[PDB]
Amino acid sequence: HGYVESPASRAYQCKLQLNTQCGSVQYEPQSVEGLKGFPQAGPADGHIASADKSTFFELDQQTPTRWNKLNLKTGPNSFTWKLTARHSTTSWRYFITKPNWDASQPLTRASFDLTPFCQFNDGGAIPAAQVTHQCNIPADRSGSHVILAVWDIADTANAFYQAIDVNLSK
């Protein structure tokens, strides 16, 4: 429960009315929550970013023209989280689809590069209610693709991937 302010996830974009059909998330974007266990005890394919919840189903299913594909660059980027919870985190991770992935298809576990490119495993970091970090997006992941950002809670078995759809460049 919280959202990433920038890069603007499809959850936050729905409230900004840049995305539609969330129904719920377009009025409360910080509603997003999910469960640890990815990939073995994780959601079904096409429900991976949704954490197997219907209100986040549009947050996993995209067509390449359905959302604002934010025009951003590879290399250093900022990642500013806005948390409605004072409790501790145990990890932050970011991972992407392959550069030539099927972008009108549901997110399968096979469509990803399952290795996170910027995992920050801080085990017990009590947040300042906001968590601004910076990280470097890989350069060979340019073009139109999705980037999933996950925040793992320390206190609970919760973790949720907040996807942002982008048109990246190098």
Coordinates of C-alpha atoms in Angstrom, one line a residue:
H1 CA 0.0 0.0 0.0
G2 CA 1.8 3.1 -1.3
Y3 CA 2.7 4.2 -4.9
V4 CA 5.7 5.3 -6.9
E5 CA 5.4 8.9 -7.9
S6 CA 8.0 8.8 -10.5
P7 CA 8.5 6.7 -12.7
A8 CA 4.7 7.0 -12.8
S9 CA 3.2 3.5 -12.5
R10 CA 0.0 2.6 -14.4
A11 CA -1.7 2.7 -11.0
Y12 CA -0.8 6.3 -10.5
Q13 CA -1.3 7.0 -14.2
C14 CA -4.9 5.8 -13.9
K15 CA -5.6 8.4 -11.1
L16 CA -3.9 11.0 -13.3
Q17 CA -6.4 9.8 -16.0
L18 CA -3.5 9.0 -18.3
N19 CA -4.7 5.4 -17.9
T20 CA -8.3 4.2 -17.7
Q21 CA -10.5 1.1 -16.8
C22 CA -8.8 0.6 -13.4
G23 CA -12.1 1.5 -11.8
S24 CA -10.7 1.4 -8.3
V25 CA -7.0 2.5 -8.7
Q26 CA -8.0 5.6 -10.6
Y27 CA -9.5 7.0 -7.4
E28 CA -7.2 5.5 -4.9
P29 CA -3.8 4.5 -6.5
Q30 CA -2.1 3.5 -3.2
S31 CA -4.6 0.6 -2.9
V32 CA -2.0 -1.7 -4.5
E33 CA -0.8 -4.6 -2.3
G34 CA 0.2 -8.2 -3.2
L35 CA 1.9 -11.3 -1.7
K36 CA 5.5 -12.4 -1.6
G37 CA 6.3 -15.7 -3.3
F38 CA 7.2 -14.8 -6.8
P39 CA 7.6 -16.8 -9.1
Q40 CA 7.0 -20.2 -7.5
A41 CA 4.1 -19.3 -5.3
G42 CA 3.4 -16.3 -7.3
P43 CA 0.3 -15.3 -9.5
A44 CA -0.7 -17.0 -12.7
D45 CA 0.8 -15.7 -15.9
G46 CA -1.0 -12.5 -17.0
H47 CA -1.7 -11.8 -13.3
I48 CA 1.9 -11.2 -12.3
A49 CA 1.8 -7.4 -12.1
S50 CA -1.8 -7.7 -10.8
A51 CA -0.7 -9.9 -7.9
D52 CA -3.7 -12.0 -9.0
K53 CA -6.3 -9.2 -8.2
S54 CA -9.0 -8.1 -10.7
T55 CA -8.6 -4.3 -9.9
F56 CA -5.0 -4.6 -11.0
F57 CA -5.7 -6.7 -14.1
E58 CA -5.4 -3.7 -16.4
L59 CA -2.2 -3.0 -14.6
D60 CA -0.8 -6.3 -16.1
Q61 CA -2.5 -6.4 -19.5
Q62 CA -1.4 -3.8 -22.0
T63 CA -1.6 -3.3 -25.7
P64 CA 1.3 -1.1 -27.0
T65 CA -1.1 1.9 -27.5
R66 CA -3.3 1.6 -24.4
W67 CA -1.3 3.6 -21.9
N68 CA 0.9 6.6 -21.9
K69 CA 4.3 5.1 -22.8
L70 CA 6.5 7.6 -20.9
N71 CA 9.4 8.8 -22.9
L72 CA 12.4 8.2 -20.6
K73 CA 16.1 7.4 -21.0
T74 CA 18.3 4.5 -20.0
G75 CA 21.0 5.1 -17.4
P76 CA 20.4 7.0 -14.1
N77 CA 16.8 7.6 -13.2
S78 CA 15.0 8.6 -10.0
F79 CA 12.6 6.4 -8.1
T80 CA 10.5 8.3 -5.6
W81 CA 8.1 6.2 -3.5
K82 CA 5.2 7.7 -1.5
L83 CA 4.2 5.4 1.3
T84 CA 1.0 5.5 3.4
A85 CA 2.6 3.1 5.9
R86 CA 5.2 3.8 8.5
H87 CA 6.3 0.2 8.9
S88 CA 9.6 -1.2 7.6
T89 CA 10.7 -2.4 4.2
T90 CA 12.9 -5.5 3.5
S91 CA 13.7 -4.9 -0.2
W92 CA 13.2 -2.7 -3.3
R93 CA 13.6 -4.3 -6.7
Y94 CA 13.1 -3.4 -10.3
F95 CA 13.0 -5.8 -13.3
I96 CA 11.9 -5.6 -17.0
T97 CA 10.5 -7.5 -20.0
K98 CA 12.9 -8.6 -22.7
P99 CA 13.7 -5.9 -25.3
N100 CA 11.8 -7.7 -28.1
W101 CA 9.0 -9.1 -26.0
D102 CA 5.4 -9.6 -27.0
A103 CA 3.8 -6.2 -25.9
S104 CA 0.1 -6.9 -26.6
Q105 CA 0.1 -10.1 -24.7
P106 CA -0.4 -10.7 -21.0
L107 CA 2.8 -10.7 -18.8
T108 CA 4.1 -14.2 -18.7
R109 CA 7.0 -15.2 -16.5
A110 CA 8.9 -16.2 -19.6
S111 CA 8.5 -12.6 -21.1
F112 CA 10.7 -11.2 -18.3
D113 CA 14.4 -10.9 -17.5
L114 CA 13.7 -12.2 -14.0
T115 CA 17.0 -10.9 -12.7
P116 CA 16.4 -7.5 -11.0
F117 CA 18.7 -4.8 -12.4
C118 CA 18.5 -2.6 -9.3
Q119 CA 17.7 -4.6 -6.1
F120 CA 18.3 -2.8 -2.9
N121 CA 17.8 -5.2 -0.1
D122 CA 17.7 -3.1 3.0
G123 CA 16.4 -5.4 5.7
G124 CA 14.8 -3.2 8.4
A125 CA 14.9 0.3 6.9
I126 CA 12.1 2.2 8.6
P127 CA 11.0 4.7 5.9
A128 CA 10.7 8.4 6.2
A129 CA 7.2 7.9 4.7
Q130 CA 8.8 8.8 1.4
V131 CA 11.7 6.8 -0.1
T132 CA 13.6 8.5 -2.9
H133 CA 16.3 6.3 -4.5
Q134 CA 18.1 6.5 -7.8
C135 CA 19.1 3.5 -10.0
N136 CA 20.5 2.9 -13.5
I137 CA 18.2 1.4 -16.1
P138 CA 20.1 -1.0 -18.5
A139 CA 20.9 0.5 -21.9
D140 CA 20.1 -2.5 -24.0
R141 CA 16.5 -2.2 -22.7
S142 CA 15.6 0.7 -24.9
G143 CA 12.3 1.0 -26.7
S144 CA 8.7 0.2 -25.9
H145 CA 8.5 -2.1 -22.9
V146 CA 7.2 -2.4 -19.3
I147 CA 9.3 -2.0 -16.1
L148 CA 7.9 -3.4 -12.9
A149 CA 9.0 -1.9 -9.6
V150 CA 8.4 -3.9 -6.3
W151 CA 8.5 -2.9 -2.7
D152 CA 8.7 -5.8 -0.2
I153 CA 7.3 -5.1 3.3
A154 CA 9.5 -6.4 6.2
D155 CA 6.6 -6.6 8.7
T156 CA 4.3 -8.7 6.5
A157 CA 4.4 -11.2 3.7
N158 CA 3.3 -8.5 1.3
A159 CA 5.1 -7.4 -1.9
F160 CA 3.6 -5.8 -5.1
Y161 CA 4.9 -5.0 -8.5
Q162 CA 3.9 -1.6 -9.8
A163 CA 4.3 -1.6 -13.5
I164 CA 5.0 1.4 -15.7
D165 CA 4.8 1.1 -19.5
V166 CA 7.5 3.2 -21.2
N167 CA 9.0 4.1 -24.6
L168 CA 12.6 4.1 -23.6
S169 CA 15.7 5.3 -25.5
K170 CA 19.5 5.1 -25.0

